[PDB]
Amino acid sequence: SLNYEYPYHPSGNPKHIDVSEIDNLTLADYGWSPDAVKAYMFGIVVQNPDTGQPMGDEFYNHILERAVGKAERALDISILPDTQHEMRDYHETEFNSYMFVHAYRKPILQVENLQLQFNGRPIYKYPANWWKVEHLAGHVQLFPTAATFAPQMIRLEYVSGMLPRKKAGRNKPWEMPPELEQLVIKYALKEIYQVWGNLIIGAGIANKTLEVDGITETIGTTQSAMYGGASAQILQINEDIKELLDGLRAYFGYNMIGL
């Protein structure tokens, strides 16, 4: 005998997240605070040259949300937990292959419903213990116990995303790797450095020197007619990302579809 909530079986598709906490989890829980961005910019202060105003946390958050979205598309991943109501078509070859299904978004934290319908009426709803999942790739497969295609025959509900990492330097397949966190921070820093590079000296100024009544000064900035003031940091960020991203793609793998 065994005890469990009916949709979730400990074998195959163990419960990982309470549905209510989907609304609770947010960016700050994953470490994507403005503090992290400021820390990586340690020793650098960004402000309006004409006033004493530094940019507020609103801009940092808005940048971070776009950055995580950009990571959400650079790799075909669903990052934050969210519920999906998904319809899928009937293809005979995968249906005969233990009802193989590849979810459109991955990873899968848990699966709540898996039904077959004809006109909105569930023709057959499978027992919970039958269906089994593979979390990282998002595969859903069915293992029953005791024309060649049709559209939108079956109905699938599940939760897509990654949980915050619980223990240091580790992560389960259903759990966020640290690399995604650093990658998103680096994407945010690309925008921040683009903003900050324009505020070094004046506006559009490359070289300066004064000489008044014996008092003389001279400065030459990073700015140039061919490169920006902060282009060095952006170049280094791109160099880091092109290694971090390619390294991370090996963890998920290439995509295939039968045809």
> Minimum distance from CB of 200 to another protein (Å)?
33
- Out of 11, 20, 124, 259, which residue is the one contacting a copy of itself (CB under 8 A)? 11
Contacting another protein within 170-189 (CB under 8 A): 173
Distance CA 176, CA 184 (A): 12
Q: Tell me the pairing of strands 139-142 and 131-134.
A: antiparallel
Tell whether residue 91 is among the known ligand binding residues.
no
Residue 259 in contact with another protein, rule: CB under 8 A: yes
The pair of three-digit structure tokens given for residue 204, joined into one six-digit string: 């559009």
- Out of 47, 48, 83, 93, which residue is the one contacting another protein (CB under 8 A)? 93
Q: Which does 42 bind (CB under 5 to 8 A by kind): Zn ion, a copy of itself, another protein, none?
A: a copy of itself
- Out of 3, 214, 256, 258, which residue is the one contacting a copy of itself (CB under 8 A)? 214
- The Cα diameter of the chain in Å comes to 99
- Out of 17, 74, 200, 241, which residue is the one contacting another protein (CB under 8 A)? 74
For residues 151-166, b (16+ Cβ closer than 10 Å) or e, as one string?
Answer: eebbbbebbbbbbebe
- Out of 3, 5, 18, 215, which residue is the one contacting a copy of itself (CB under 8 A)? 215
Closest alpha carbon to 174 in 157, 186, 154, 158 = 158
> Minimum distance from CB of 139 to another protein (Å)?
6
> Minimum distance from CB of 79 to a copy of itself (Å)?
7
User: Which strands, in side-by-side order, build the sheet including 139-142?
Assistant: 101-102, 139-142, 131-134
Distance CA 81, CA 21 (A): 9
Q: Which does 47 bind (CB under 5 to 8 A by kind): Zn ion, another protein, a copy of itself, none?
A: a copy of itself
- Out of 89, 224, 232, 238, which residue is the one contacting another protein (CB under 8 A)? 89
Site string for another protein, 218-257 (x = CB under 8 A): ----------------------------xx-xxxxxxxxx
